[PDB]
Amino acid sequence: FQSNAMFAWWGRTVYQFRYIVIGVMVALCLGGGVYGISLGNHVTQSGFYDEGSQSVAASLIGDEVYGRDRTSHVVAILTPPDDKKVTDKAWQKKVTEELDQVVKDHEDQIVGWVGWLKAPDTTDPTVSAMKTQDLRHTFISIPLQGDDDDEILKNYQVVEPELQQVNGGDIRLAGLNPLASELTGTIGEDQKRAEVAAIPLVAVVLFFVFGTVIAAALPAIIGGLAIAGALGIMRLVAEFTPVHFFAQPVVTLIGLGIAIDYGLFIVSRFREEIAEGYDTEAAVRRTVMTSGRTVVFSAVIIVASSVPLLLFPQGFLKSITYAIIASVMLAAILSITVLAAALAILGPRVDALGVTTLLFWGRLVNVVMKRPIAFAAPILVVMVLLIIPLGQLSLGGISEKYLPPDNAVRQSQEQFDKLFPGFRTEPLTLVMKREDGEPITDAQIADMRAKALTVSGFTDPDNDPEKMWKERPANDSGSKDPSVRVIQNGLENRNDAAKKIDELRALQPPHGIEVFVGGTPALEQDSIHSLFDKLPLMALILIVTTTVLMFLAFGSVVLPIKAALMSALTLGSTMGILTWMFVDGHGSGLMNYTPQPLMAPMIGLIIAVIWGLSTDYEVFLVSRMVEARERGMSTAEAIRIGTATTGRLITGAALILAVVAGAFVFSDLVMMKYLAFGLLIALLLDATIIRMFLVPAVMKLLGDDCWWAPRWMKRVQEKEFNIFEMLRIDEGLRLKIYKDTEGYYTIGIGHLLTKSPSLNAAKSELDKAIGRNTNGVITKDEAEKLFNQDVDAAVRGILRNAKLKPVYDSLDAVRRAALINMVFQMGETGVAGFTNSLRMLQQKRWDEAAVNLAKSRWYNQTPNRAKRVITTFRTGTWDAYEFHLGGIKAFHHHHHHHHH
Ligand SMILES: CCCCCCCCCCCCOC[C@H]1O[C@H](O[C@H]2O[C@H](CO)[C@@H](O)[C@H](O)[C@H]2O)[C@H](O)[C@@H](O)[C@@H]1O
Ligand SMILES: CCCCCCCCCCCCOC[C@H]1O[C@H](O[C@H]2O[C@H](CO)[C@@H](O)[C@H](O)[C@H]2O)[C@H](O)[C@@H](O)[C@@H]1O
Ligand SMILES: CCCCCCCCCCCCOC[C@H]1O[C@H](O[C@H]2O[C@H](CO)[C@@H](O)[C@H](O)[C@H]2O)[C@H](O)[C@@H](O)[C@@H]1O
Ligand SMILES: CCCCCCCCCCCCOC[C@H]1O[C@H](O[C@H]2O[C@H](CO)[C@@H](O)[C@H](O)[C@H]2O)[C@H](O)[C@@H](O)[C@@H]1O
Ligand SMILES: CCCCCCCCCCCCOC[C@H]1O[C@H](O[C@H]2O[C@H](CO)[C@@H](O)[C@H](O)[C@H]2O)[C@H](O)[C@@H](O)[C@@H]1O
Ligand SMILES: O=C(Nc1ccc(F)c(F)c1F)N[C@H]1[C@H]2C[C@@H]3C[C@H](C2)C[C@H]1C3
Ligand SMILES: NC(=O)CN(CC(=O)O)CC(=O)O
Ligand SMILES: NC(=O)CN(CC(=O)O)CC(=O)O
Ligand SMILES: NC(=O)CN(CC(=O)O)CC(=O)O
């Protein structure tokens, strides 16, 4: 079951209203583009955790009662100039005043500054540790105003320009916000690196696919309107849900490439249509009915590959999922609206301006025909090697190591940790809430502590177990509700976390108190637990729905099961090279990144994206080889017909995508590099090794078993348009006796009954011809009967004429019908008058014949029918009749009215 009546309708409709269409959509895309530049101000950095987990619950309760921890917001290492010691009172007074200035100039953003520098005469050991022992360094804590991560980062980025000039500029800022500003700032550099490098490179790859400026520029314009509109959509989405920072580059990395690839593939088909002889209107419609459906289905495939990501609770993956969907749907819509309308207006003009104005696959597939196992077996091995570095991979949260090793903020963090060890902590929290609502007594606190001391592995600095699990600090932002108490202690090994959290939760609460285990390790481990929990379901939904969509596309059970195996191998192989690059560390030196575990949600994203890419490239390649089977062409070069037809397009499309992805591999954010490289690898793999070799090999051997259609699973083949339906349009179909334009009694399809004025003489003839008493009325079947006889009579007359027989034998079945049509209309003697045009048709000079025929009096007297017939001669298809300007008003009986 399918509907191309929808696409045939739109293909016609979009040409008709091409001005309204191109005006409206551009207005929205540029409108949304203007609305969508404010997106950078409404994105979030939160969404990496499971907000339904126990650790998040512990965090919200903790921040409510005790106040959120603001001590790690801004850490600032101060160092005296000229080898001076930090004890220098003049330098102390100067810097203290500088710091007090920044705070009073920004009281809306800064809570204040805390450190040894504020009270140099102190005996508090921890405060005395805020200075190094050689007295060359000292750091301060600068807590900021704000009630969520985004508002706090905004407050930092406001005070940063002045905070940086403190102590003559020699102040090193670190902590959460200087790192967050740097991490989120990577998005901006990646956007501009794409503008500068990717766009000109794409323009070049485009002007090498088409040898023409206008033709090359259109897919680029589509890509621009896509991004603009998509950013507007996402900005609108941000009005309802939180949209993560990382959703912005996804719109560019994935959205831009596919939009241009869509535009490339559609403009490419439009020129093909024009070349084969179709006029602009028919060319547009045929493009939409074919390549347009390929684009829409491609969009469906990608969406079906991305929706399973919604199974994960992380807002990071959700907003990214929304971003992918918005981008691809808009790209698919724009490619068959704005682009189609543009071509409809331009027409053959798309090739006007040349390159100067600015200023073989089938042989190789045949080489892999001859020896499947020569290539295939030796590839299945090469890929499963790649799957064993995949086998070993680790997972971790965001750290300063996500930035390059030479990043100034990362190093300032790493210098802080070296100069001032023990300040940066990751304690696990035991959050206690009494349900009935009354205060928590010290006995229950001491009770929980004893149970906390049951579990080994928690830090004990000064070797005293009853000073462990100290109460969490309280500040002025906490409600200090007595029914909630929090105790905490760090782990001695962080790798123990997952086990210890399960142990801390395995503990049994004091009667009447609920215990939530929190802390940054707990937040991270719970998030990882969530992903591995729902990953099997996603993979199933992913594999099933794509395989189901391939059932619909191929018309086979074998091929989808085969294709899913191909995807799972490109996926496993790619993720293996990825693990080999970013965990095992190969390529880190050249690329300036630090080998480390991967971000966990990136794994779901990279599975969906790689799988979708693999599936999309397969469906396009294979369904054209299916076409050979539909045509009756044998398997062996069915496989070759499809590979060659697509060959130059796929490379051009993949190259364009590779160029876009290749610009993001230089990002300073390491999880961006992981994603971008994952594309390049899977893309080059799918566009070379998979496409060129593995697929043709494997398909041959299950040689004709590839296609298999249990029952009605396969589609029945449509009624083929015939000469009956053709002249039913040009001469009409009447089931009751009427008078034609000469007042002669006619019936069926222009079938002259008699030139007699007597209706009963006419009824006599009809009764004769049909074989029954008709009362002047026949069925549709009987009309086709009369018509067939008339056709036979005309063909006999044609084969009898010395001027018509040669060209008639020369012609294909469709063009033969075009000639019989002319014979019906004006008779053999009339048609034989087109001596040169007939010669041109006989020599298959379709273009010259079509042009010459339109210069006849035949064309001037009956343009609509002539244009139809002439078009049929030009293209050799029924296209001019399957969709047409309805309504013949003037009925005239044809020659060769055959009587029995
Ligand atoms: C990416 C990770 C980034 C790395 C994270 C860096 C963490 C740095 C932590 C810095 C915490 C500095 O420590 C804060 C110390 O002073 C605070 O204020 C107080 O100072 C003296 C009290 O001793 C008195 O003047 C006042 O009571 C009061 O103002 C607390 O009251 C003390 O409890 C605490 O000992
Ligand atoms: C586009 C690229 C993206 C770059 C990534 C940047 C990441 C930088 C790390 C910043 C994390 C700040 O962490 C500090 C806070 O951690 C937890 O609270 C956070 O987690 C809770 C449960 O979700 C929320 O309820 C709180 O709102 C939320 O502040 C603690 O409870 C807070 O006491 C502590 O102050
Ligand atoms: C607001 C309410 C609106 C909500 C509904 C929006 C959802 C849109 C659903 C429409 C799905 C149509 O997509 C499926 C169509 O195209 C696919 O074939 C394409 O793939 C291969 C080319 O590569 C070849 O099979 C064909 O040449 C090519 O058309 C399918 O296999 C066909 O069965 C079907 O004709
Ligand atoms: C758009 C594309 C932009 C650039 C594409 C680059 C992709 C990187 C593919 C894999 C990188 C290897 O090839 C380039 C690398 O060769 C060497 O590696 C050396 O150490 C590695 C681990 O031990 C091993 O590769 C060898 O042992 C040894 O050759 C250099 O030491 C690296 O500095 C350099 O990176
Ligand atoms: C078939 C595949 C098609 C491939 C298409 C190619 C895409 C076009 C993009 C080419 C622009 C190359 O730009 C290279 C970028 O890195 C440079 O050095 C950095 O290198 C490492 C991080 O990248 C670290 O060491 C430091 O951040 C820093 O030294 C600069 O920081 C940037 O200004 C520059 O833009
Ligand atoms: O680029 C894709 N897909 C794709 C890209 C990036 C992704 F991140 C992803 F998930 C994908 F699925 N498909 C192209 C389009 C569609 C169709 C004909 C042309 C143009 C060749 C080929 C197949
Ligand atoms: N020493 C190196 O060659 C760097 N290596 C790192 C390593 O050997 O593990 C890979 C690279 O960075 O290209
Ligand atoms: N359509 C035609 O063949 C018209 N021909 C008529 C002919 O061949 O006698 C004139 C021409 O070719 O210029
Ligand atoms: N379409 C009509 O009503 C009459 N037609 C003549 C015909 O259909 O044979 C004129 C034309 O095709 O331009």
Side-chain angles (χ1 to χ4, degrees), residues 11-129:
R12 182 187 320 116
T13 299
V14 69
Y15 173 80
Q16 188 171 9
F17 306 104
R18 57 192 189 272
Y19 291 106
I20 296 178
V21 165
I22 202 172
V24 167
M25 300 295 304
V26 162
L28 294 199
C29 291
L30 296 186
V34 168
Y35 180 58
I37 47 188
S38 64
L39 176 60
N41 296 329
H42 299 85
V43 281
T44 181
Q45 69 191 50
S46 86
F48 290 116
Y49 301 149
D50 185 352
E51 254 176 29
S53 73
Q54 186 179 124
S55 49
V56 165
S59 300
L60 287 169
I61 296 181
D63 300 337
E64 172 72 20
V65 175
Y66 282 85
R68 71 192 307 127
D69 183 24
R70 321 176 93 97
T71 66
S72 307
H73 283 176
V74 180
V75 133
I77 307 174
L78 291 158
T79 304
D82 312 332
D83 258 317
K84 300 219 188 98
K85 267 51 188 171
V86 317
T87 50
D88 192 319
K89 229 90 208 181
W91 175 89
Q92 281 183 15
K93 211 205 59 164
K94 192 188 75 66
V95 166
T96 297
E97 292 176 351
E98 284 190 330
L99 291 172
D100 291 333
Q101 253 285 345
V102 177
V103 174
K104 60 172 176 290
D105 281 346
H106 300 291
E107 23 180 300
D108 273 346
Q109 294 79 31
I110 305 180
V111 173
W113 68 276
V114 171
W116 176 91
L117 197 60
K118 191 161 237 186
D121 299 339
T122 182
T123 53
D124 191 345
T126 51
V127 185
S128 289

Side-chain angles (χ1 to χ4, degrees), residues 561-577:
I561 302 302
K562 170 197 161 300
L565 261 50
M566 300 267 166
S567 296
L569 256 80
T570 274
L571 170 62
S573 314
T574 297
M575 293 197 56
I577 305 183

Side-chain angles (χ1 to χ4, degrees), residues 548 551-552 555-557 707-717:
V548 168
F551 282 150
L552 301 180
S556 172
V557 148
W707 318 270
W708 184 49
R711 33 168 216 300
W712 226 92
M713 233 131 96
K714 250 134 106 132
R715 155 185 78 163
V716 188
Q717 47 294 342

